[PDB]
PDB file of C-alpha atoms in Angstrom:
ATOM      1  CA  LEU A   1      -9.006  13.586  14.542  1.00 46.30           C
ATOM      2  CA  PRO A   2      -5.249  13.110  14.334  1.00 46.31           C
ATOM      3  CA  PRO A   3      -3.528  14.710  11.301  1.00 50.12           C
ATOM      4  CA  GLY A   4      -4.150  13.029   7.890  1.00 49.71           C
ATOM      5  CA  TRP A   5      -7.572  11.595   8.991  1.00 49.04           C
ATOM      6  CA  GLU A   6     -10.978  12.896   7.878  1.00 51.67           C
ATOM      7  CA  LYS A   7     -14.606  11.678   8.552  1.00 54.31           C
ATOM      8  CA  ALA A   8     -16.690  10.389   5.581  1.00 53.15           C
ATOM      9  CA  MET A   9     -20.023   8.386   5.183  1.00 53.61           C
ATOM     10  CA  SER A  10     -20.293   5.298   3.276  1.00 54.63           C
ATOM     11  CA  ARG A  11     -22.089   5.819  -0.081  1.00 55.95           C
ATOM     12  CA  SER A  12     -23.778   2.446   0.122  1.00 56.21           C
ATOM     13  CA  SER A  13     -24.790   2.425   3.839  1.00 52.62           C
ATOM     14  CA  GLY A  14     -24.478   5.999   5.079  1.00 52.03           C
ATOM     15  CA  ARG A  15     -22.479   4.850   8.031  1.00 49.22           C
ATOM     16  CA  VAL A  16     -19.613   7.102   9.270  1.00 47.80           C
ATOM     17  CA  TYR A  17     -15.985   5.892   8.533  1.00 49.14           C
ATOM     18  CA  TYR A  18     -12.567   7.534   8.584  1.00 50.53           C
ATOM     19  CA  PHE A  19     -10.097   7.854   5.681  1.00 51.56           C
ATOM     20  CA  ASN A  20      -6.417   8.970   5.721  1.00 53.77           C
ATOM     21  CA  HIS A  21      -5.400  11.009   2.667  1.00 53.14           C
ATOM     22  CA  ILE A  22      -1.642  10.275   3.224  1.00 52.50           C
ATOM     23  CA  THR A  23      -1.913   6.433   3.375  1.00 51.54           C
ATOM     24  CA  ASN A  24      -5.259   6.005   1.615  1.00 54.62           C
ATOM     25  CA  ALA A  25      -6.341   3.721   4.481  1.00 53.36           C
ATOM     26  CA  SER A  26      -9.958   3.642   5.488  1.00 58.81           C
ATOM     27  CA  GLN A  27     -11.520   2.162   8.617  1.00 57.52           C
ATOM     28  CA  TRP A  28     -14.864   2.149  10.581  1.00 56.44           C
ATOM     29  CA  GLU A  29     -13.362   3.210  13.955  1.00 54.35           C
ATOM     30  CA  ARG A  30     -12.502   6.801  14.885  1.00 54.93           C
ATOM     31  CA  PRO A  31      -8.624   6.633  14.845  1.00 56.33           C
ATOM     32  CA  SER A  32      -6.741   8.527  17.642  1.00 56.85           C
ATOM     33  CA  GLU A  33       7.592  10.238  15.002  1.00 59.81           C
ATOM     34  CA  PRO A  34      10.340   7.499  14.986  1.00 57.75           C
ATOM     35  CA  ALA A  35      13.771   7.837  13.372  1.00 60.83           C
ATOM     36  CA  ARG A  36      13.017   4.634  11.385  1.00 58.72           C
ATOM     37  CA  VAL A  37      10.129   2.375  10.467  1.00 55.45           C
ATOM     38  CA  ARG A  38      10.205  -1.050   8.967  1.00 55.96           C
ATOM     39  CA  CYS A  39       7.681  -1.864   6.209  1.00 57.36           C
ATOM     40  CA  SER A  40       6.781  -4.554   3.841  1.00 55.72           C
ATOM     41  CA  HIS A  41       5.051  -3.838   0.506  1.00 56.55           C
ATOM     42  CA  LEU A  42       3.442  -5.395  -2.490  1.00 57.45           C
ATOM     43  CA  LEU A  43       4.016  -3.401  -5.713  1.00 57.08           C
ATOM     44  CA  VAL A  44       1.947  -3.824  -8.832  1.00 58.62           C
ATOM     45  CA  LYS A  45       3.677  -2.048 -11.821  1.00 59.27           C
ATOM     46  CA  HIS A  46       1.901  -0.811 -14.933  1.00 59.03           C
ATOM     47  CA  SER A  47       2.955   0.418 -18.422  1.00 54.71           C
ATOM     48  CA  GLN A  48       3.945   3.908 -17.105  1.00 53.42           C
ATOM     49  CA  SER A  49       6.079   2.627 -14.304  1.00 54.23           C
ATOM     50  CA  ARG A  50       9.631   4.051 -14.432  1.00 53.05           C
ATOM     51  CA  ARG A  51      10.857   0.585 -15.312  1.00 50.08           C
ATOM     52  CA  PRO A  52       7.928  -1.461 -16.646  1.00 50.49           C
ATOM     53  CA  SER A  53       9.524  -4.890 -15.950  1.00 50.72           C
ATOM     54  CA  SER A  54       9.957  -7.233 -12.998  1.00 47.06           C
ATOM     55  CA  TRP A  55      10.954 -10.762 -12.084  1.00 53.58           C
ATOM     56  CA  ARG A  56       7.306 -11.678 -12.907  1.00 53.82           C
ATOM     57  CA  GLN A  57       7.163 -10.317 -16.424  1.00 54.11           C
ATOM     58  CA  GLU A  58       9.841  -8.905 -18.715  1.00 52.48           C
ATOM     59  CA  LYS A  59       7.592  -6.366 -20.394  1.00 56.99           C
ATOM     60  CA  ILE A  60       4.685  -5.115 -18.144  1.00 55.51           C
ATOM     61  CA  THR A  61       1.879  -3.756 -20.294  1.00 56.33           C
ATOM     62  CA  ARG A  62      -1.134  -3.501 -17.870  1.00 58.30           C
ATOM     63  CA  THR A  63      -2.713  -0.042 -17.609  1.00 59.52           C
ATOM     64  CA  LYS A  64      -2.564   1.997 -14.437  1.00 59.46           C
ATOM     65  CA  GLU A  65      -6.300   1.190 -14.127  1.00 63.84           C
ATOM     66  CA  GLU A  66      -5.736  -2.538 -14.364  1.00 65.49           C
ATOM     67  CA  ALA A  67      -2.905  -2.296 -11.780  1.00 66.67           C
ATOM     68  CA  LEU A  68      -5.264  -0.471  -9.352  1.00 67.28           C
ATOM     69  CA  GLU A  69      -7.960  -3.131  -9.855  1.00 70.40           C
ATOM     70  CA  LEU A  70      -5.369  -5.803  -8.919  1.00 68.03           C
ATOM     71  CA  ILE A  71      -4.252  -3.761  -5.890  1.00 67.96           C
ATOM     72  CA  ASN A  72      -7.842  -3.339  -4.713  1.00 68.96           C
ATOM     73  CA  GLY A  73      -8.471  -7.164  -5.100  1.00 70.64           C
ATOM     74  CA  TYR A  74      -5.423  -7.949  -2.920  1.00 69.45           C
ATOM     75  CA  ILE A  75      -6.505  -5.396  -0.271  1.00 72.18           C
ATOM     76  CA  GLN A  76      -9.924  -7.123  -0.125  1.00 73.97           C
ATOM     77  CA  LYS A  77      -8.423 -10.494   0.266  1.00 74.78           C
ATOM     78  CA  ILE A  78      -6.015  -9.364   2.972  1.00 79.13           C
ATOM     79  CA  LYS A  79      -8.732  -7.550   4.924  1.00 82.51           C
ATOM     80  CA  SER A  80     -11.040 -10.548   4.695  1.00 84.58           C
ATOM     81  CA  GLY A  81      -8.422 -12.943   6.073  1.00 86.18           C
ATOM     82  CA  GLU A  82      -8.694 -15.103   2.975  1.00 88.84           C
ATOM     83  CA  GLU A  83      -4.969 -14.434   2.119  1.00 87.02           C
ATOM     84  CA  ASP A  84      -2.036 -13.168   4.112  1.00 82.79           C
ATOM     85  CA  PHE A  85      -0.230 -10.017   3.011  1.00 86.22           C
ATOM     86  CA  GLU A  86       3.088 -11.998   2.984  1.00 88.58           C
ATOM     87  CA  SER A  87       1.722 -14.682   0.815  1.00 90.66           C
ATOM     88  CA  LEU A  88       0.357 -12.221  -1.793  1.00 89.54           C
ATOM     89  CA  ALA A  89       3.555 -10.113  -1.703  1.00 84.63           C
ATOM     90  CA  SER A  90       5.698 -13.295  -2.413  1.00 83.75           C
ATOM     91  CA  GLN A  91       3.510 -14.301  -5.327  1.00 87.02           C
ATOM     92  CA  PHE A  92       2.501 -11.044  -6.885  1.00 86.59           C
ATOM     93  CA  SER A  93       4.731  -8.174  -5.998  1.00 88.38           C
ATOM     94  CA  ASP A  94       6.640  -6.716  -9.034  1.00 90.72           C
ATOM     95  CA  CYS A  95       9.768  -6.077  -6.971  1.00 91.46           C
ATOM     96  CA  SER A  96      12.612  -8.299  -5.872  1.00 93.23           C
ATOM     97  CA  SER A  97      11.528  -7.804  -2.161  1.00 94.05           C
ATOM     98  CA  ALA A  98       8.774 -10.349  -3.059  1.00 95.01           C
ATOM     99  CA  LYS A  99      11.429 -13.040  -2.267  1.00 94.61           C
ATOM    100  CA  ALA A 100      11.475 -11.686   1.322  1.00 91.92           C
ATOM    101  CA  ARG A 101       7.595 -11.771   1.675  1.00 93.23           C
ATOM    102  CA  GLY A 102       7.656  -8.089   0.711  1.00 93.78           C
ATOM    103  CA  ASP A 103       9.910  -6.916   3.569  1.00 97.73           C
ATOM    104  CA  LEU A 104      12.057  -3.845   2.851  1.00 98.07           C
ATOM    105  CA  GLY A 105      13.744  -3.745   6.275  1.00 97.36           C
ATOM    106  CA  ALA A 106      14.020  -0.529   8.371  1.00 98.92           C
ATOM    107  CA  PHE A 107      14.575   2.876   6.785  1.00 96.98           C
ATOM    108  CA  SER A 108      14.677   6.573   7.675  1.00 98.59           C
ATOM    109  CA  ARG A 109      13.281   9.627   5.947  1.00102.64           C
ATOM    110  CA  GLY A 110      15.413  10.487   2.872  1.00101.83           C
ATOM    111  CA  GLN A 111      15.708   6.991   1.317  1.00101.50           C
ATOM    112  CA  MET A 112      12.426   6.014  -0.388  1.00100.30           C
ATOM    113  CA  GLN A 113      10.191   7.775  -2.995  1.00102.71           C
ATOM    114  CA  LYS A 114       8.405  10.484  -1.178  1.00102.14           C
ATOM    115  CA  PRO A 115       4.730   9.248  -1.339  1.00104.00           C
ATOM    116  CA  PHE A 116       6.046   5.811  -0.129  1.00104.57           C
ATOM    117  CA  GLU A 117       7.971   7.467   2.682  1.00103.22           C
ATOM    118  CA  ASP A 118       5.063   9.654   3.850  1.00 99.79           C
ATOM    119  CA  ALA A 119       2.571   6.785   3.824  1.00 96.07           C
ATOM    120  CA  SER A 120       5.082   4.568   5.754  1.00 94.00           C
ATOM    121  CA  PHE A 121       5.670   7.120   8.474  1.00 90.16           C
ATOM    122  CA  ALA A 122       1.933   8.028   8.732  1.00 91.37           C
ATOM    123  CA  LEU A 123       0.881   4.366   9.325  1.00 92.05           C
ATOM    124  CA  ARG A 124       0.630   3.085  12.923  1.00 93.23           C
ATOM    125  CA  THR A 125       2.637  -0.095  13.751  1.00 91.81           C
ATOM    126  CA  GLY A 126       0.811  -3.058  12.256  1.00 92.58           C
ATOM    127  CA  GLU A 127      -1.398  -0.901  10.012  1.00 95.12           C
ATOM    128  CA  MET A 128      -1.729  -1.381   6.241  1.00 97.44           C
ATOM    129  CA  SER A 129      -2.125   1.483   3.672  1.00 99.72           C
ATOM    130  CA  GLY A 130      -4.583   1.681   0.815  1.00100.49           C
ATOM    131  CA  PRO A 131      -3.198   2.024  -2.694  1.00101.91           C
ATOM    132  CA  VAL A 132      -0.089   4.304  -2.663  1.00100.88           C
ATOM    133  CA  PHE A 133       1.012   5.661  -6.098  1.00 99.57           C
ATOM    134  CA  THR A 134       4.678   6.305  -6.873  1.00100.85           C
ATOM    135  CA  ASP A 135       6.630   6.395 -10.186  1.00 97.55           C
ATOM    136  CA  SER A 136       7.404   2.720  -9.640  1.00 96.75           C
ATOM    137  CA  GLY A 137       3.700   1.648  -9.701  1.00 92.97           C
ATOM    138  CA  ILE A 138       1.008   1.228  -7.081  1.00 91.47           C
ATOM    139  CA  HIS A 139       1.942  -0.177  -3.537  1.00 90.54           C
ATOM    140  CA  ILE A 140       0.157  -1.694  -0.585  1.00 88.17           C
ATOM    141  CA  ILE A 141       2.364  -0.904   2.402  1.00 88.39           C
ATOM    142  CA  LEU A 142       2.391  -2.722   5.747  1.00 91.64           C
ATOM    143  CA  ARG A 143       4.155  -1.051   8.625  1.00 91.92           C
ATOM    144  CA  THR A 144       5.687  -3.825  10.709  1.00 90.24           C
ATOM    145  CA  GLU A 145       7.812  -1.757  13.213  1.00 93.25           C
TER     146      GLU A 145
END
């Protein structure tokens, strides 16, 4: 397995899957570094975020648990095809990059919060993370280049 990836079995079906403890991604297939990557993200903030406020809501009072439930709902919808990542980032992301469909542009190591940076650089091009926790809130990250 490449670094970051481990083998697991589904608790409901027993079937083997793979999970990445740096990005929190999980997938059924056995999976197998640049100066910069470009990512988009969708951030859902909660009451312990460093600044609990966004263009969506002046005072954010959801718990960290409620934020993760929202994140997991958006991941489901994106993986199902029912909604596009871009569409959910524009509507729901608690960051001003929502107005750019969640795009953050290209960045190097050194610029972003560290868990965000590590997950971004551990994703393959086109791959989406699972929930990624930072002091700003909980992210879904899409590596676009």
